[PDB]
Amino acid sequence: QGIPVFDGTRALDFVQQFARMKEQLDTAKDQLAEAQ
Amino acid sequence: QGIPVFDGTRALDFVQQFARMKEQLDTAKDQLAEAQ
């Protein structure tokens, strides 16, 4: 679009959110293994 | 709104987040198939 901007704060926040999503995915896979 | 801005960094980050949400959804569907 126009006038690109780098929201430096969201980068750290997005890294943390990505880590928590990884951990949620790992827990879900553990549940799947348990059910199997 | 006003003065549109393209946060080029979030685009890559959003792609990664979308991939992880896809994988979470796939795991949830696998759990559902297991329970059924």
Alpha-helical runs (H) found in B1-36: 8-35
Contact A18 B21 (CB under 8 A): no
Question: Hey, are the CB atoms on B21 and A17 less than 8 Å from each other?
Answer: no
* A35 touching chain B per CB within 8 A: yes
Which experimental approach was used here?
cryo-EM
Question: A23 with B24: CB under 8 angstroms?
Answer: no
Chain B residues in contact with A36 (beta carbon < 8 A): 34
Structure tokens at B34: 């297991």
Resolution in A: 3.0
Residues near B5 by Cβ (< 8 Å), separated by ≥ 6? A1, A2, A3, A4, A5
Residue type, B20: R
Residue A7 touches partner B, C-beta closer than 8 Å: yes
Classify B5 as helix, strand or coil. coil
Cα B21 to Cα B14: distance, rounded to the nearest angstrom: 10
